[PDB]
Design a protein around this ligand. Structure first.
Ligand code: 97V
Ligand SMILES: *[C@@H]1O[C@H](CO)[C@@H](O[C@@H]2O[C@H](CO)[C@@H](O)[C@H](O)[C@H]2NC(C)=O)[C@H](O)[C@H]1NC(C)=O
Ligand SMILES: *[C@@H]1O[C@H](CO)[C@@H](O[C@@H]2O[C@H](CO)[C@@H](O)[C@H](O)[C@H]2NC(C)=O)[C@H](O)[C@H]1NC(C)=O
Ligand SMILES: *[C@@H]1O[C@H](CO)[C@@H](O[C@@H]2O[C@H](CO)[C@@H](O)[C@H](O)[C@H]2NC(C)=O)[C@H](O)[C@H]1NC(C)=O
Ligand code: NAG
Lengths: 214, 231, 545
């Protein structure tokens, strides 16, 4: 099996920047490499083939280079349409293997999340479970950290996070961390806090409520 | 006009089976090798099988060997993937691609040009779960969901199957400040998401905020009203 | 084209295999299932073994590798061994060609195929023009003309050259080619029939290129000889010859110089009596022409004192006078004087009647060669018989001199370096063997070229001079080619080892070979098609219609 290591996984550029996704191979796959672009929700489209040979009707910003074991895709001037995911594929041996993929996100200044907390609705409690959500809103970069605290006690294994695609207007991300416990579990503990930690935050932001319906 | 249309995809249970189909038009199907590739929801591309015209030459990725089978009807310009003994891990979007090869008669050597043209994709989803409308709960705005002169509120679209749901605010009027998070599969096997909107704190009490969950798979349309908490 | 033939045989082997394989019984054991793996037919083979079958017959080189075998490993699993993409794998190292898949890029490939069409037409247009010109010259009322007979053999050399390149191209289009990726792959391998044919063609081509310059050397010697004056010296020189030491004759005398005699009794130191005198000091073209220049004036003096011979001499033009002087030189005043009826006819300007009368005598019997050239000189009144004497030499310095160099070069190539079609870049024998004679020819064509200009100023300053005269007209053709061809083939070979292939060298290649392709029409045009005399004969043949 030929392992394809794609570097980097995610990268941050601005329209104009030279971008270089590289993609290494664990054996000599010769010149049998091709670069695909996948747009969100759409089927991948092939850009470079035979390592360096540009496909028909692909802008000349894209260029391929490499041989044997080192392979490099290069956009000279990233436009708005290029901030998507890219894969190398090798077709030198079965099983055909891809690189892990490279997301090209649109760079911007650091912006701390504005944090928000929401207690579980009355009609949810009726049904026999309590979902508490914490909302980190309009931040950058994407890597943030939500630490649920209940009765000043760390929580683990019991919550789930979800993240938006990079916002097209302002290039920020938002994430939500939903803590779900049974009504029974939920009615035991008074205070529910949501500790957020992010690079635009010298000090962590904690939003908390303690079963006051307010 | 060179294009490939997949079909056959849909919701199926662990252990049961599915024959995906991939229908070539715009080219001489017989002369091209053909490939299936899957992409699981979060994850990246994964090659799964290939078949050449002969078709003595056939291959599969390890995780599907014996379990999956590829075939082609050259008369109907169709490629197939008989998937048996389905597991959760086969949940994926199944593209079909073609590869052009070339045999050198003078040497007996073969050359391979890779996957140039791909299908649109057909979603396959392996769950024991049954169709179910979402219960929609409010995420009520309060003192603990206001930063300065701005509130946030939302709707918890919970315990529905399968994807997707469309969420809308005020029947289309409000689309500024709105964030609909991608769904997350729970341990229960059902999906849950939240749509959230950021509005001016003053505008609470004045305007009404109603979220509009539509879940087509179960013929469900719910409109929850979002009422500010107070004490 | 050529691949399409192979495709049908390959396919046929394929059907022949599938039909062969159907009639065999099913296997009791676990084997690698029988298959046609696109290359050869393979029976059921037990696992852990390497099967064998002879090299498939569809291959263009089957006969050279029919004794050889292809192998195929049947793997432990019961399945045959596959390559990286699961394709059939085998060892047909033995069956492989004696050649190379030479990969040629899409844009370099399309370019050479475009620039090929340019040179293929240039030579064909030079072919039709040369073969028309030959049909114009040889078929027509210049049927026995000496001036055209040199042009005709030049044209034949350029027909040979042109013909040889068309054969070579036609054989190199045999080469097997296919689209591998964006590149076009072209096989070097050529069939034994195709190898032999193009080899011979290459010899003919190399023989033509030496023949061209050997026949353009003849075209230049022609004008140099033709335009010297021409004089009674050269006439009696060709009739007799130069010498410096004495030797005995039909009568047994001290004959020396050009038909002169030194003494009256058979003696050597008494022959010195006149040889010391006529120089007057203590044997050359600078010295011993003084003997010939007395003998002519003495012969001219004697003719004016002879009553039968003087009014014939008087009545004759300058060139026929030189023919009568010749006759006296051979025989004498008395002998010639007794051609009483032949003389009467020359005085009456009845040349064809004189000619038949002179041939009837026992002079034309005793010397049929000299009397024939002299009679012609009377017949026509030009120096044509003496220009014609040099022709049989010019055949063997046009045809045989190339054959002296190239045929042993063809023997050399055979025994040392035996490539399919010989256009090699080795430089061991395409410098010394084939390029030396073209250099040595051009060298002599340059020593002449200047000797023609000094010969043409002297002609044009004297009263032998007018501009519409055919002798000047013909120099407009010859004097252009020797500078055009002499530059083009030395600047080529001087700078033909400088670039490796190349991009600028292959750009140089096409600018030169496109000029070389039209080379055979340029010659056809300026000699045959632009000649006044020939243009008038077309206006006579076409106007009888
Ligand atoms: C300016 S001068 O008057 O003092 C003079 C001196 C020396 C030569 C020429 N001329 C010449 O160089 N030419 C034209 C030409 C004219 C007449 C005949 C011809 O009818 N010859 C013939 N008659 N019978 N048999 N042969 C042939 C040729 C000529 C010029 C150029 C070229 C090439 C230049 C490179 C491009 C290709 C043509 C060839 C010939 C005039
Ligand atoms: C190798 O050869 C055997 C026959 O010698 C193949 O057996 C086939 O088995 C299938 C299974 O039902 C039948 O449909 C066919 O009729 C059999 N082949 C015939 C009649 O030729 C065996 O399958 C072959 N190996 C592979 C991988 O196909
Ligand atoms: C395959 O060809 C070989 C010739 O290479 C045939 O003969 C065998 O040759 C090997 C060595 O090359 C000898 O050591 C064996 O003893 C030969 N075996 C014979 C004559 O039976 C061989 O028979 C061929 N295979 C078949 C099935 O015909
Ligand atoms: C060909 O030889 C190899 C090497 O001995 C065999 O590989 C062995 O296979 C047997 C079962 O047939 C196993 O018990 C061994 O563990 C294998 N050893 C290895 C892989 O080193 C192979 O099976 C042989 N082929 C046949 C058809 O028996
Ligand atoms: C196939 O049949 C032909 C007779 O038509 C025979 O010459 C040949 O040996 C057979 N076997 C193979 C392997 O082609």
């Amino acid at each position: 099996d030929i392992q394809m290591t794609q570097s980097p996984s995610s990268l941050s550029a601005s329209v104009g920047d030279r971008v270089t996704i590289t993609c290494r191979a664990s054996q000599g796959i010769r010149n049998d490499l091709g670069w695909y672009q996948q747009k969100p929700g759409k089927a991948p489209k092939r850009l470079i083939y035979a390592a360096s040979s540009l496909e028909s009707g692909v802008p000349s910003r894209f260029s391929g280079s490499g041989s044997g074991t080192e392979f490099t895709l290069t956009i000279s001037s990233v436009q708005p349409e290029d901030f998507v995911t890219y894969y190398c594929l090798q077709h030198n041996s079965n099983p055909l293997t891809f690189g892990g993929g490279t997301k090209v996100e649109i760079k911007r200044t650091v912006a701390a999340p504005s944090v928000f907390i929401f207690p579980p609705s009355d009609e949810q409690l009726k049904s026999g479970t309590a979902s508490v959500v914490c909302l980190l809103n309009n931040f950058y970069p994407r890597e943030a950290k939500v630490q649920w605290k209940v009765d000043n006690a760390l929580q683990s294994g019991n919550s789930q996070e979800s993240v938006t695609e990079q916002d097209s207007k302002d290039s920020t991300y938002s994430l939500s961390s939903t803590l779900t416990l049974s009504k029974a579990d939920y009615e035991k503990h008074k205070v529910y806090a949501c500790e957020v930690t992010h690079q635009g935050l010298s000090s962590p932001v904690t939003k908390s409520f303690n079963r006051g319906e307010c | 006009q060179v294009q490939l249309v997949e079909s056959g995809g849909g919701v199926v249970q662990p252990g049961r089976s599915l024959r995906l189909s991939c229908a070539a038009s715009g080219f001489t199907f017989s002369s091209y090798g053909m490939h299936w590739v899957r992409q699981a929801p979060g994850k990246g591309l994964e090659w799964v099988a290939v078949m050449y015209y002969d078709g003595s030459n056939k291959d599969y990725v390890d995780s599907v060997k014996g379990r999956f089978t590829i075939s082609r009807d050259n008369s109907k310009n169709t490629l197939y993937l008989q998937m048996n003994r389905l597991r959760a891990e086969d949940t994926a979007v199944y593209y079909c691609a073609r590869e052009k090869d070339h045999y050198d008669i003078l040497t007996g050597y073969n050359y391979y040009y890779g996957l140039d043209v791909w299908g649109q994709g057909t979603t396959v989803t392996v769950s024991s779960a049954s169709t179910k409308g979402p219960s929609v709960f409010p995420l009520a705005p309060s003192s603990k969901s206001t930063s300065g002169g701005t509130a946030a509120l939302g709707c918890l679209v919970k315990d529905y199957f399968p994807e997707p749901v469309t969420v809308s605010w005020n029947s289309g009027a409000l689309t500024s400040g709105v964030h609909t998070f991608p769904a997350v599969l729970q341990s229960s096997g059902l999906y849950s998401l939240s749509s959230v909107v950021t509005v001016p704190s003053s505008s609470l009490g004045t305007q009404t905020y109603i979220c509009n969950v539509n879940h087509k798979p179960s013929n469900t349309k719910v409109d929850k009203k979002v009422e500010p908490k107070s004490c | 084209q050529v691949m399409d033939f192979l495709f049908e045989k390959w396919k046929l082997y394929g059907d022949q295999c599938h039909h062969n394989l159907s009639l065999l019984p099913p296997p009791t054991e676990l084997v690698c299932n029988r298959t046609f793996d696109k290359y050869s037919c393979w029976p059921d083979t037990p696992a852990n073994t390497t099967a064998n079958i002879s090299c498939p017959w569809y291959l263009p080189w089957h006969h050279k590798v029919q004794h050889r075998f292809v192998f195929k490993r049947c793997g432990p699993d019961g399945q045959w061994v596959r390559g990286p993409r699961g394709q059939p794998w085998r060892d047909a190292s033995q069956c492989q060609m004696d050649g190379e898949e030479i990969e040629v890029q899409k844009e370099v490939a399309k370019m050479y195929s475009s620039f090929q069409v340019m040179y293929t037409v240039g030579y064909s247009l030079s072919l039709g023009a040369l073969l028309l010109a030959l049909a114009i010259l040889g078929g027509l009322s210049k049927l026995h003309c000496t001036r055209n007979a040199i042009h005709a053999n030049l044209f034949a050399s350029f027909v040979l050259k042109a013909s040889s390149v068309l054969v070579i191209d036609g054989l190199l289009r045999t080469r097997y080619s296919q689209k591998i990726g964006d590149d076009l792959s072209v096989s070097t391998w050529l069939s034994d029939g195709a190898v032999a044919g193009c080899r011979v063609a290459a010899v003919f081509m190399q023989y033509g290129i030496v023949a061209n310059y050997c026949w353009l050397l003849v075209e230049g010697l022609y004008l140099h000889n033709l335009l010297g004056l021409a004089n009674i010296f050269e006439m009696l020189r060709i009739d007799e010859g130069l010498r410096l030491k004495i030797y005995k004759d039909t009568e047994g005398y001290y004959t020396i110089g050009i038909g002169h005699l030194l003494t009256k009794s058979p003696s050597l130191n008494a022959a010195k009596s006149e040889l010391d005198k006529a120089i007057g000091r203590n044997i050359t073209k600078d010295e011993a022409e003084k003997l010939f220049n007395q003998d002519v004036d003495a012969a001219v003096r004697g003719i004016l004192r002879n009553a039968k011979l003087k009014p014939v001499y008087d009545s004759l033009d300058a060139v026929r006078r030189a023919a009568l002087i010749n006759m006296v030189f051979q025989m004498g005043e008395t002998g010639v004087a007794g051609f009483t009826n032949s003389l009467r006819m020359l005085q009456q300007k009845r040349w064809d009647e004189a000619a038949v009368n002179l041939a009837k005598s026992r002079w034309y019997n005793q010397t049929p060669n000299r009397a024939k050239r002299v009679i012609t000189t009377f017949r026509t009144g030009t120096w044509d018989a003496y220009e014609r004497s040099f022709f049989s030499l010019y055949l063997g310095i046009g045809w045989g001199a190339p054959m002296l160099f190239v045929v042993p070069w063809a023997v050399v190539k055979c025994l040392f370096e035996n490539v399919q079609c010989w256009t090699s870049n080795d430089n061991m024998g395409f410098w010394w063997i084939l390029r030396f004679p073209v250099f040595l020819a051009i060298l002599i064509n340059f020593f002449i070229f200047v000797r023609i200009v000094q010969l043409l100023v002297a002609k044009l300053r004297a009263r032998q001079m007018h501009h519409t005269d055919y002798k000047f007209r013909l120099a407009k053709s010859t004097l252009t080619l020797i500078p055009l061809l002499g530059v083009h083939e030395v600047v080529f070979a001087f700078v033909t080892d400088e670039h490796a292939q190349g991009t600028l060298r292959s750009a140089k290649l096409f600018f030169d070979l496109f000029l070389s392709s039209f080379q055979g029409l340029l010659v056809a045009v300026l000699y045959c098609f632009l000649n006044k005399e020939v243009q008038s004969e077309l206006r006579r043949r076409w106007h009888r219609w």
